[PDB]
Amino acid sequence: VPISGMRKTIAARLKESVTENPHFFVSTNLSVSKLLKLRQALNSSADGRYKLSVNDFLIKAMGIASKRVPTVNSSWRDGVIRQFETVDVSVAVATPNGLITPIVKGVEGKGLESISAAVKELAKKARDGKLKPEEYQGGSISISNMGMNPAVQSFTAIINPPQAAILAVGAPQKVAVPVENEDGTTGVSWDEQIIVTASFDHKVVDGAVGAEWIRELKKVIENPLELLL
Amino acid sequence: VPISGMRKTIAARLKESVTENPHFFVSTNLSVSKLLKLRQALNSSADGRYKLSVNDFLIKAMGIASKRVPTVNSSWRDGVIRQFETVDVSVAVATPNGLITPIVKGVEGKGLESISAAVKELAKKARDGKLKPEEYQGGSISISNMGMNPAVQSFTAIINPPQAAILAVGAPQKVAVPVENEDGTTGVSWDEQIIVTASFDHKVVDGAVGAEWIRELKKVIENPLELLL
Amino acid sequence: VPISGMRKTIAARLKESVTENPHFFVSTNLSVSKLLKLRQALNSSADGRYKLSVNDFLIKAMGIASKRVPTVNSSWRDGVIRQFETVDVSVAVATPNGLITPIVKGVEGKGLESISAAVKELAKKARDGKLKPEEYQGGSISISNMGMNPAVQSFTAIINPPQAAILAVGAPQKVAVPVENEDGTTGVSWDEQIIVTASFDHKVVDGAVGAEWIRELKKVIENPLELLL
Amino acid sequence: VPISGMRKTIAARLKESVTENPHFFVSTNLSVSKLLKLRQALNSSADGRYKLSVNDFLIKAMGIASKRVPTVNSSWRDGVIRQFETVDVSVAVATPNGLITPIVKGVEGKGLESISAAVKELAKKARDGKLKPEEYQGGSISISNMGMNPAVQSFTAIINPPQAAILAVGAPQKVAVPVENEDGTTGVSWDEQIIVTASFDHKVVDGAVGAEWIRELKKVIENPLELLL
């Protein structure tokens, strides 16, 4: 079968990414037992005006982490580092045509409802093939999601240039966790975990900086109430 | 110590692989408690006519998944995608001379006993150094195994070109899993888990396609009776 | 009523068969209590993608037995024995026009789902009268089924030339079987049996060979897990 | 594969048999629970001087039945019926070369030990290929045995000409049988049965005659003590 030609550009782009920018990976585990309760409560206290998912919370947390650590929200240009202020998030969508990356603008201080609405709009518009180039050309940070497929415990991705980082969220799973009952003995409790994998560019970011970013993300998620901050 | 010269070719090949094809990894966890029982029962209901292993089941499942999702069983050629129909599986063997990749032909609809016989034959012939080039030059998909070494929980490998994907199977381990007793309380059950890592080329395959392939593999393994299908 | 003319050809064919080839019969009893459980479980673990019967398992077992004993998969030609390698299976279908024998190709190493799909397609095409001559001219081995009729315990058939053997599968029935309880006393267990009748041509096959073939068939059925092998 | 030529003669012989002689079959069920006890006791009350089987008892019973009903021990010749007085028994042996029928002479009034010795000698001489034509050319009645194969419940055979009848003995099996305990209630007893199939030529013998022969056989077996008579 001959190549469609469109895949050629994507292959060249990815080749540029891997050959220009080295890649190192960080892998952590989050706890979402409180996040799911929060999502359920907000969904129930509603009149069909909105519907939430895990990706939106993750996007808000990404924005907060980027603002607390601006070095990640950066890039690599001609002998100069370009540093933004806001957070432009590229969300991946898997069409039968292939892959596409619409963008959400001004995440930090936008609202989860607006986020979900914009993501639904862009996803349906990509399934229809009705996008503009500016809506998927740009962005400082990216994300790919596979939570629907329960088999994937974890996976890596490739950094869509000229960006510096990219995230990946596996499926949820059941894990054993210790717990202290009212007496001195320990007990078993079942916590819902997710694995998260972040690939970074080493020219800009160091292992310590990436670890700090991941720590802030884990903290914000495990304490969802700090999303207000 | 000067270089043997043979290692030069493998180095150049791996360099071509990583520089021509970008790599992204997927990591999942399988449950094999039923698979091991099946292997035990089939080994018992025999008269020394055969002996099975986990790799053979894995190879059969790879064939089934490749047939259900043919995009993986592909390659990258001069401005064209070559898509096969059958599944040619490259199995790795670690000789004192290094690494070698014999091939099994027409896996789908071949039989586990024939598979085991062919694998044993090729492995002993590789230990003796009695192979032909056609036997290890080709193949659409590959695999490497390290189950004998119990310490390796997981590992990655490199795509032997011109193929598109490669698999890797860690060791088995003991993991906690919830279970519902006959009453309403949950309990602790010890299941035998294996980590599996799949490296894909991003020019041909996308994340959704890889996830679908892994899902089918997990389903087939967890329900071994579907191997008949 | 004058004769349709089509029956003339079938009469001459059967006359040639009985006058050229002597017939001897072998009658055995199988146990399918495990087979039916397997079929029920595979049907339950599905999404309507397929639906299985007993004839398909029987056909797979026929292929396995033919491969373990290739002398059965034979014929008689002009001063020469033609021996095949693959198993082409002629399945009988009872149309209002009469009897017809479509063929399934390459049974050994094909898969039960594909077998069922091909059989359904051929059966509907025969009910419609839309077949080619090649699809029902050939085959090394044949079979006739009457399982829908619960009255028939056993029955013989006639060897469709130039083949050497043919099968016949009666209905299931309830039979008494001894069983040892946990104590030393025996008990009564109700097993679901089927009678099977195989007609052979004596020029090619002998009683010992037919008995060996039937033993392998009984073994593979009573241990359905060996269908993988 | 071209034909060995030896099979040509056997094919022509069997063709002559089926085209000259019509075949009808009679199928019955025996009870051997006492016979096996008798065999075990006679084997235990010995010094390794002999070793018995079931076929020898069967051959003695065949001789007794043939003498009680001489019409079976007959043939068909040129406008004349040739009737013998003694019973010459053709026993089948399955060599890798094919099938062969050595003969035992003067069965009636010979003794089971002598019968077993002669059968062992003839069987080993047939496995070695050291026979004379007279030793397997003749005989008034024939038999084939498949008791070693537990899968075969019943089977037919073909009349070796110019004889008029032939026997066939399946495997033993477990069957449910009623039994009256000391009280008025019935109970379940497990008896060891064998199916027996006798093929007859219809020119000489009729259904009533065959039934009488089978009745006498069943009687002598079920009451083994009448073997003395």
Author numbering:
A (entry chain OA), B (entry chain M), C (entry chain KA), D (entry chain L): 230 to 458
What's written in the study?
The pyruvate dehydrogenase complex (PDC) catalyzes the further formation of acetyl-coenzyme A (acetyl-CoA) from pyruvate, enabling the tricarboxylic acid cycle that sustains oxidative phosphorylation. The PDC is a multienzyme complex consisting of three components: E1, E2, and E3. Without exception, the PDC is organized by non-covalent recruitment of E1 and E3 to a large core built from E2 catalytic domains.
In order to characterize the fungal PDC, we purified intact complexes from N. crassa mitochondria and reconstructed its native structure from single-particle cryo-EM data. This showed a dodecahedron-shaped core with icosahedral symmetry, composed of 60 E2 core-forming domains decorated with many flexibly tethered enzymes surrounding it. The only observable points of contact with the E2 core are in the twofold interface bridges connecting the density-associated E2 trimer to each of its three neighbors. The backbone and direction of the BH could be traced from our reconstructions, but the resolution did not permit assignment of its primary sequence. The cryo-EM reconstruction of the N. crassa PDC core exhibits strict icosahedral symmetry, but with an additional protein PX that forms a tetrahedral assembly interior to the core under optimal conditions.
